[PDB]
């Protein structure tokens, strides 16, 4: 049972690290999307003009 618990603890810690990496991926993609959105807003203003 101690072996099983050690395996589970190590796996869960590594999974937490993986989830942190995924959060980083999401943040980077969202920043790129925000810049694209600002460009689109400016283009719409130019079209209205």
């Amino acid at each position: 049972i101690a072996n099983r618990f050690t395996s589970n603890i190590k796996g869960l810690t590594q999974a937490a690290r993986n989830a942190n990496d995924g959060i980083s991926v999401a943040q980077t993609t969202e920043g790129a999307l925000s810049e694209i959105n600002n460009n689109l807003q400016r283009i719409r203003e130019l079209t209205v003009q």
């Binding site: 395996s7 589970n8 869960l12 999974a15 999401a26």
Partner: protein, 48 residues
């Protein structure tokens, strides 16, 4: 996300560019390109 097999979370991504938003020949002033199409055997038969 888990310690056993199959315990995953999926992040879907999208191909975002001019092509997937349209806007290709935005052409506000009326001067631009279309990059029309590539022909096929059905088009040739229709043309005769």
């Amino acid at each position: 996300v888990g310690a056993n097999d199959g315990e995953t979370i999926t992040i879907d991504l999208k191909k975002i560019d001019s092509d997937t938003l349209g806007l290709n020949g935005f052409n506000v002033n009326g001067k631009g390109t279309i990059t029309n199409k590539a022909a096929t055997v059905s088009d040739l038969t229709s043309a005769g």
